Design a binder for this molecule. Structure first.
Ligand SMILES: COCC(CCO[C@H]1CC[C@@]2(C)C(=CC[C@H]3[C@@H]4C[C@@H]5O[C@]6(CC[C@@H](C)CO6)[C@@H](C)[C@@H]5[C@@]4(C)CC[C@@H]32)C1)COC
Ligand SMILES: COc1ccc(CCN(C)CCC[C@](C#N)(c2ccc(OC)c(OC)c2)C(C)C)cc1OC
Ligand SMILES: Nc1ncnc2c1ncn2[C@@H]1O[C@H](COP(=O)(O)OP(=O)(O)NP(=O)(O)O)[C@@H](O)[C@H]1O
Ligand SMILES: [Mg+2]
Length: 1199
């Protein structure tokens, strides 16, 4: 027990890992480290040189004020201005150079790190033991290959460079502000820190609201998942409003939390602007108060104020960039957990022995095995067997005996706890695993061919052979010979290219017969010593089976072979047959020997013989008409913003002019002016605050509303679709749930909030331009011509960042798809030992991709650096022109700084709208997908349409008639299920539809319920076609009891009343279902929760609840689609008691696999390939000695 349990956990134990940036940045080797260092240095420099613009602005402001006061001569003013303009030019050039190098080197280093991570991941995944790989959920490895490596690459991409730039900018801004003027900087820092620690409550509230909304939509998404999975039951019982009301109850909680989200976002975005203008006014006021003692001047006050705000504003950029770093580290924590895990079997190394002159003899001695997933069941117990060279052995038995467990033990996929497996007397645990797998050839039931030429697919089996590295002509001859010996040359010659044709997604797609023969050729070409045939003809068509079986027999006449045959006629001439029952060998010997013993083999042969004998924005705005009451004020607060920012610029210009003091004699007057305007700069600062407290709020509210509708309607548009919509491969339950999660959420980027923000930004930009032109037309015209440049730069910074974000995902697609292809077929890869070749191909692909990607990036990084450096040049031109204007008297210091602050506000307000650009990158896509979903309408089976003859209960006879019905499943229209089916149920008949499996007897339920319409033919209820009846009332007449009982999450009373068409009909139905006793025995009454929690119920009680649900509506036609073909024998009797009572008094159509139930049917119909072969009662069918007789004999033997 201790050793066994330790082995079973160690085979599957996935140890966790906590990754950091040390692990990610240690992927560099040697001279690559310098690149990383260089990148960071550049980033830091590109962040430290940015707040020097505040220094140069302060110096130019001081020069302008001094010249206006009359302190210095024209020549001095011109020379100083020109020197400051040169300083802007130098700063712009430096910003360009360092931004280029920082971005390029960060991207290159991220490419290198992620490529190393990808290589290590694929190498590690390929060489894990199969037990761990099976444990990994479906699609986990492919998601780690495709969508977890991009996150790692982003975490160390230019995003971390921008985070470092933001931190450096904050540090440098604080340093500049404290070095130039420390007293005012200290006062401003104290006030800002106080106002931030005072806004910590609002941030906490916003994060809480986000978390609560996420949880509420998680509950809503669980309701959506259960409805889609149980869409048949909901369609049959008309539970399309019940599911929608359970969904709407949870997407109305998300709206309630979105109202807190809106309030918190409005408060936070108002606090951020309160800090801005409060600091501005306080800086100017306290600087004037300190000037009466320091003579600091306007320059130092402006430098300190600008540096403080600059530093604070960039804190937001650091947080957004650091989000990517945190997400990347979490993805690394995942990928490094798997990369570091050591496999249970050391197949990567070359440790082990290699048998020379391998004969091909195998020996199992008391082999015992328990799978790691289920450590309590012994799948294989005391397995003993000896296979001499040349002996073809056959493993037979019922499903779950453990036949494929022997092959899994041989191939080292799983570990055997006790016993001993010997290859020519050498223990299997002391042999090289890759060599062991090379000495065998595994031919599975489902053949896997990879996306390559048939020549390459066949050569995939030459790994580790003596012919692995030979001249290509010898390889071509070998492939030709192997394809001839596999009966594959015949159809290969027919194809145009021949051996070079590409079998895979791209190129021709072959039938199982061709794919299986190519797999046989790939197996034979290696000349194996042991052949493992695991049902190589199980899924094959009967006609194809002949050619392939011939190939398999010719292959296996001369090698040690272990045949697991689905058809026992193929293994009659096997040298030895072993019968397995629950992992134990019951008998072994020749065909004639076992038959004379009349044991399990005799029964299996008899059953086989019997079976053989029987056989865009305006659209969403129009949808959300409610936003019309959130767009009447938003065009009035915008007007207020358009009259508040120009006023703010005017006041700022007046305050700067007030500082034109020649000496200490002007300090009193200045102070008075400073005071007065600083009052207005507050009174107009608060008004705008109020606007933000409303405006942002409305934005978020609007968005929330839209999302809610885009959820509700979308769900209401999925429940409307007919079953053919849900049969399509794309419309999986998980896919539809993910679409409901994503698209309604993502369409929030083109809501009324975006329109309001765009309108506000446009109004502010236009108001700034108008104010600048009115104040001084000579200056406003240049401001009008610099604003297009200053806005394009701000937009294209975001656009190029988006391009950098998209490149990572769009570039590693030709290579991630290859890895997902070779990993989705991982047992085939492992058994061929194609692990090294796949590693070499994938590594070469991504190594080429790195070199391509660096040169791809450099071109865009050039433009990004140019845009980043553009701003100081614009400021230099503006200041030079302004100084030339003050020279000629055509402008005033007040007018110049009013224009400057106006264009500053315009560019800061238009940069709020550009941050919406990434969102509209996805929202647009979402919008078009949602429009298709809303427009999707079922062809004929529509529940919402009120067109059709309604049914009258008084005249409702309840008879059914399928007249000349033929039907094909739309997914596979080639294969017919029903052909020319003529069938009649008279009213009140208890009819049973028995038949061989695959006869399409269960499709009659779908046709009567009108899940589908017949391709050609008619279905009539009481002489009236069902296509002319109202679907809702028709389905209310019917009732359905499915094979596996479905109970939607909720109380027992709710599930039982789903089929209600008074609290006493429900009791009566529960009594008729023999379930009321169990209900009264529950801790509570009918309020007990069943779905997904509460008192769990057995299959019998679930089926009885389903029967009561069907019974409440008092149906005239009860459709029992194998209501007991899921129950154990003991439970089946009470469920059958419930079923028999329901049949009395109404038309009942029972499809049953256990023909004991249908023994009391008035008329029994037997199906065969979709047509009614035999009809009549039980005794007459028995006397007929036909297909029903064979079925009852088969059921008697099968047990
Ligand atoms: C699951 O959660 C998902 C998440 C939900 C929202 O999370 C919030 C977390 C806090 C965070 C990052 C958010 C918005 C504004 C951010 C603030 C701006 C302020 O600016 C400063 C500096 C400048 C000052 C003037 C004002 O204060 C900072 C101290 C303040 C700040 C950086 C503190 C952190 C805030 C988003 C994202 O969803 C898209
Ligand atoms: C022109 O291109 C851009 C220009 C500026 C920006 C920066 C965006 N700003 C940080 C938005 C500031 C928002 C904010 C408000 N309200 C604000 C701050 C300062 C402002 O003037 C100094 C301001 O004027 C409206 C607004 C604060 C809440 C932060 C980005 C740009 O591209 C994304
Ligand atoms: N990876 C696994 N983890 C746990 N149990 C497993 C695993 N694989 C198979 N089993 C169970 O082990 C038993 C034997 O499985 P298996 O060896 O596949 O039998 P089989 O006779 O080859 N099946 P079949 O090919 O359908 O006739 C059954 O109970 C299986 O459900
Ligand atoms: Mg099997």
């Amino acid at each position: 027990d201790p050793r066994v349990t330790e082995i079973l956990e160690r085979q599957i134990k996935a140890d966790s890992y906590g990754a950091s940036l040390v692990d990610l940045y240690g992927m560099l080797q040697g001279w690559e480290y310098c690149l990383a260092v260089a990148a960071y240095i550049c980033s830091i420099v590109a962040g430290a040189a940015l707040p020097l613009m505040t220094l140069i602005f302060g110096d130019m402001a001081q020069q302008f004020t001094d010249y206006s006061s009359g302190l210095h001569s024209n020549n001095q003013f011109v020379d100083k201005i020109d020197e400051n303009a040169l300083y802007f030019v130098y700063l712009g050039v430096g910003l360009l150079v360092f931004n280029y190098f920082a971005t390029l080197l960060h991207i290159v280093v991220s490419e290198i790190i992620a490529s190393r991570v990808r290589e290590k991941f694929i190498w590690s995944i390929l060489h894990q033991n199969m037990a761990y790989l099976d444990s990994l959920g479906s699609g986990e490895i492919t998601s780690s290959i495709t969508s977890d490596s991009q996150l790692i690459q982003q975490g160390v991409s230019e995003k971390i460079g921008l985070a470092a730039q933001s931190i450096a900018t904050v540090v440098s801004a604080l340093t500049v502000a404290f070095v130039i003027y420390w007293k005012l900087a200290l006062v401003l820092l104290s006030v800002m820190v106080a106002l931030i620690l005072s806004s910590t409550p609002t941030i906490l509230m916003l994060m809480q609201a986000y978390t609560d909304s996420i949880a509420s939509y998680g509950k809503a998404s669980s309701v959506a998942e259960e409805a889609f999975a149980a869409i048949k039951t909901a369609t049959a019982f008309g539970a399309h409003e019940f599911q929608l009301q359970k969904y709407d109850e949870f997407i109305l909680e998300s709206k309630g939390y979105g109202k807190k989200k809106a309030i918190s976002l409005a408060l936070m975005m108002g606090s951020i602007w309160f800090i801005v203008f409060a600091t501005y006014a306080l800086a100017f006021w306290q600087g004037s108060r300190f000037m009466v003692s320091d003579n600091s001047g306007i320059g130092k006050i402006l430098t300190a104020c600008m540096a403080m705000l600059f530093g604070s504003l960039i804190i937001g950029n650091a947080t957004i960039s650091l989000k990517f770093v945190m997400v990347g580290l979490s993805a690394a924590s995942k990928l490094f957990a798997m990369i570091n895990r050591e496999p249970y079997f050391d197949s990567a190394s070359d440790a082990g022995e290699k048998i020379n002159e391998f004969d091909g003899s195998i020996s199992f001695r008391n082999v015992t095995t328990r799978y790691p997933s289920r450590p309590d069941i012994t799948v294989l117990s005391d397995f003993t067997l000896d296979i001499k060279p040349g002996q073809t052995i056959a493993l037979v038995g019922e499903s779950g005996s453990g036949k494929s467990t022997v092959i899994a033990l041989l191939e080292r996929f799983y570990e055997y706890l006790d016993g001993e497996i010997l290859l020519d007397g050498v223990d299997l645990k002391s042999l090289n695993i890759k060599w062991v797998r090379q000495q065998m050839a595994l031919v599975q039931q489902e053949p896997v061919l990879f996306a390559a030429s048939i020549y390459e697919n066949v050569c995939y089996g030459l790994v580790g052979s003596k012919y692995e590295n030979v001249t290509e002509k010898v390889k071509r001859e070998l492939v030709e010979k192997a394809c001839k010996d596999a009966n594959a040359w015949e159809f290969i010659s027919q194809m145009s290219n021949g051996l070079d044709t590409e079998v895979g997604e791209r190129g021709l797609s072959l039938s199982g017969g061709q794919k299986q023969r190519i797999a046989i050729a790939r197996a034979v070409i290696s000349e194996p010593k042991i052949l493992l045939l695991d049902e190589a003809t199980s899924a094959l068509d009967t006609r194809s089976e002949g050619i392939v079986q011939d190939a398999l027999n010719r292959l296996s006449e001369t090698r040690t072979t272990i045949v697991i045959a689905h058809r026992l006629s193929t293994i009659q001439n096997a040298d030895l047959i072993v019968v397995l029952s629950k992992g134990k060998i019951v008998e072994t010997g020749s065909h004639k020997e076992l038959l004379k013993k009349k044991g399990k083999y005799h029964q299996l042969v008899q059953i086989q013989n019997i079976r053989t004998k029987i056989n865009l924005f305006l659209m969403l705005l129009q949808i959300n008409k409610g936003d019309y009451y959130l767009l009447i004020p938003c065009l009035f607060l915008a007007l207020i913003a358009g009259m508040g920012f120009p006023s703010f610029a005017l006041l700022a210009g007046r305050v700067i002019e007030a500082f034109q003091v020649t000496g200490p004699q002007d300090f009193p007057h200045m102070r008075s002016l400073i005071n007065k305007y600083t009052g207005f700069l507050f009174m107009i600062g608060c008004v705008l605050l109020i606007v933000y407290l409303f405006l942002t709020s409305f934005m978020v509210l609007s968005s929330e509303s839209l999302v809610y509708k885009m959820r509700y309607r979308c769900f209401k548009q999925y429940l409307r679709q007919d079953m053919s919509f849900f049969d399509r491969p794309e419309n999986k339950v998980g896919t539809l749930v993910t679409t409901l999660a994503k698209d309604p959420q993502d369409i929030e980027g083109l809501s009324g909030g975006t329109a309001a923000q765009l309108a506000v930004s446009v109004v502010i930009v236009v108001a700034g331009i108008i104010l600048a032109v009115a104040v001084n037309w000579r200056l406003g015209l240049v401001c009008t011509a610099t604003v297009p440049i200053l806005l394009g730069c701000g937009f294209f910074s975001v656009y190029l960042l988006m391009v950098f974000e998209e490149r990572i995902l769009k570039d590693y697609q030709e290579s991630a798809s290859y890895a997902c292809e070779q990993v989705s077929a991982l047992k085939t890869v492992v058994s061929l030992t194609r692990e090294v070749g796949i590693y070499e191909k994938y590594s070469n692909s991504i190594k080429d991709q790195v070199k391509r990607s660096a040169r791809s990036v450099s071109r865009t990084t050039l433009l990004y650096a140019l845009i980043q450096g553009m701003n100081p040049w614009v400021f230099a031109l503006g200041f030079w022109y302004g100084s030339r204007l003050l020279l000629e008297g055509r402008a005033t210091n007040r007018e110049f700084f009013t224009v400057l602050m106006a264009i500053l506000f315009g560019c800061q307000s238009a940069g709020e709208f550009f941050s919406y650009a990434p969102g509209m990158g996805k929202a647009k896509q979402a919008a078009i997908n949602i429009r298709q979903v809303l427009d999707t309408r079922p062809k004929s089976i529509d529940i919402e349409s009120e067109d059709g003859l309604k049914i009258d209960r008084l005249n409702l006879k309840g008879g059914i008639e399928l007249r000349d019905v033929t039907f094909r499943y739309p997914t596979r229209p080639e294969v017919p299920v029903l052909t020319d089916l003529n069938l009649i149920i008279k009213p009140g008949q208890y009819v049973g539809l028995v038949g061989a499996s695959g006869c399409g007897k269960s499709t009659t339920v779908g046709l009567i319920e009108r899940f589908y319409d017949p391709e050609s033919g008619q279905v009539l209820l009481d002489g009236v076609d069902i296509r002319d009846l109202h679907l809702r009332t028709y389905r209310e007449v019917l009732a359905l009891v499915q094979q596996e009982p479905v109970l939607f999450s909720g109380s027992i009373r709710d599930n039982i009343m789903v089929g209600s068409i008074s609290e006493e009909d429900m009791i009566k139905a529960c009594k008729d279902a023999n379930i009321y006793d169990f209900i009264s025995s529950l801790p509570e009454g009918f309020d007990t929760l069943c779905g997904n929690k509460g008192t769990m119920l057995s299959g019998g009680q679930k089926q009885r609840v389903a029967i009561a649900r069907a019974l409440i509506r008092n149906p005239r036609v009860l459709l029992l689609d194998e209501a007991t073909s899921a129950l154990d024998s003991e439970s089946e009797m009470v469920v059958q008691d419930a079923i028999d009572k329901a049949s009395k008094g109404r038309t009942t159509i029972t499809i049953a696999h256990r023909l004991s139930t249908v023994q009391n049917c008035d008329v029994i119909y037997v199906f065969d390939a979709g047509r009614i072969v035999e009809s009549g009662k039980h005794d007459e069918l028995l006397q007929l000695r036909g297909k029903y007789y064979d079925l009852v004999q088969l059921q008697g033997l099968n047990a």
